[PDB]
């Protein structure tokens, strides 16, 4: 989530005064090239480096990745509601997240570098196979970066992290 280790250099700048989504690239600043769903969306030649996705009320989404002097970073699955990506389902106040990779192993879920879906003492957070369910989702509290990894594997080894910001 917070760390860029694992080629997760694409991060969302959560310091916006307005309801705009800004994407940040964690690379050696020479020239920043931003990509969206595999297609290049801009080329920042010095000066500015953050990628503006527009107002969050427009529900920005997609697999966003950047590239400086090195190769492109891992995709950032953006999902706002005001390579196989993580599937997001919203039904009333319940948010369902489906792990893109479900090889049948013990799949673990983490929310902003915090394990979730393991203990049964949470009625509003249940894990069923590769599906993570969040009942009574809190827009301010349940939003952030999400990633799923099998037991024994590092979350940083996930192919892409899911950035969710949904108002329910």
């Amino acid at each position: 989530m917070q760390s860029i280790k694992g080629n997760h250099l694409v991060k969302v700048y959560d310091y916006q005064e307005d309801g705009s989504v800004l994407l940040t690239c964690d690379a050696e600043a020479k020239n920043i090239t931003w990509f969206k769903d595999g297609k290049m969306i801009g080329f920042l030649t010095e000066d500015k480096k953050k990628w503006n996705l527009g107002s969050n009320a427009k529900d920005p989404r997609g697999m966003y990745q950047c590239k400086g002097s090195q190769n492109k970073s891992k995709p950032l699955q953006v999902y706002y509601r005001m390579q196989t990506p993580y599937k997001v389902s919203i039904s009333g106040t319940t948010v369902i997240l489906t792990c893109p990779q479900y090889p049948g192993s013990e799949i673990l879920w983490q929310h902003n570098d915090k394990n979730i879906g393991g203990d049964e003492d949470d009625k509003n957070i249940g894990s069923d196979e590769d599906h993570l369910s969040l009942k009574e989702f809190s827009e301010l509290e349940q939003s952030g970066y999400y990633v799923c990894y099998p037991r024994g594997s590092k979350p940083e080894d996930a192919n892409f992290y899911l950035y969710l910001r949904a108002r329910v």
Partner: single-chain antibody
Amino acid sequence: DIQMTQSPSSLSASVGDRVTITCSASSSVSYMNWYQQTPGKAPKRWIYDTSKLASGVPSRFSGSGSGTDYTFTISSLQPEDIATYYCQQWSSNPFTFGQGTKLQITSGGGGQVQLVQSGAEVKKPGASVKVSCKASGYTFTSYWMHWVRQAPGQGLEWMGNIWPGSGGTNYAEKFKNRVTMTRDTSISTAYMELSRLRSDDTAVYYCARSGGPYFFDYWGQGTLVTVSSDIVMTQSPLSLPVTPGEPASISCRSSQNIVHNNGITYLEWYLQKPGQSPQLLIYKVSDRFSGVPDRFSGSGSGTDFTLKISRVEAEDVGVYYCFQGSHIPPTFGQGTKVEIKSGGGGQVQLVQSGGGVVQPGRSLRLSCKASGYTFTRYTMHWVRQAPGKGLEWIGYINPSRGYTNYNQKVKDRFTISRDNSKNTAFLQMDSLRPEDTGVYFCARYYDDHYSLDYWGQGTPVTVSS
């Protein structure tokens, strides 16, 4: 599945020699873990995250590697390092382990100076016992086969020297009229006979060999003579406990100034490791003997001397008797039995049960009891170690969620179940075949360390008709 190659499959090295084991992965692995598996012992993780050594691992071990290449390196080979060192990758299921690197000692004795004592003497009160120390690998007529005895509840108390070539023996004051030591230069052996064996003279009697600067260099095996019906150096600490890796310190005080008239202070700190003969660990007050790790490095001056083990590993546990021979009778201290902390707090253990001999086609149910940690917070894995083969992962079950993953070879025959109420995982093996015979050990996996840190004792199962 990612294939792991271990190089070399078997390596023989001399004591102190640098030993390197190479691990080659069929695919780029983010981290490779190293496990130390002694013969008949469960695999013990050597290094995690491919560079972080597990707790208690001596600094002589080092891990390196990235992507598809990883290496396990030993700075200085030791007899305790004899074990099967295997690399394991968890980047993709199943957690694959290498074929195993069989580490052997390439010493072969090398006719190294090795005194060998008689041993196993039990007498009656008032009798006499004669001990013999068959020297080998040295000019048995050029080194003074000094004798020394440490009775149960006492330190190193010399029993009087010899000059094995000429037979001209000095002797010990408290035994001058009872212990006569005569050599046999032809058979390359020294002999010492103690007369009128009392009750207080039951002990283990060693036969040193006073070296150049280091008295009692190569101590014999030691004979236990149990018969039943002087500059005073005392060791400051006693039973001084330290934690694994915690720095320790044992000190000793001299009754007089133990700097000899020759100007060389013949103070030394022998280190009777548990179960072995005492072995020099400081040749003089400060210098260390050849073959002692860099950790053990004492110091002192005048009448106060103190040993300071820089990092008390599992290898330093044993009574560190402190000897001072600059005075005529060679008298030592009582020595501080430096022992591990032995807290017992991390009682995390996996007890394996349910093994035995079963017929082919029958079903065997294995149980692995977990205690000392949250059973639901960690994943318990099943790994089978076939006779003569490397570690093979069978599967695992998540106690918190119930999610189970199994290797395709045994996914249709082995079932992973967990009992959170008893903190035990169940490995139901159905239709067991002769190929299923082997050692199955349950390992608790640390996701944050990306390594199975705690592994069970292993349960042998034999599929025989």
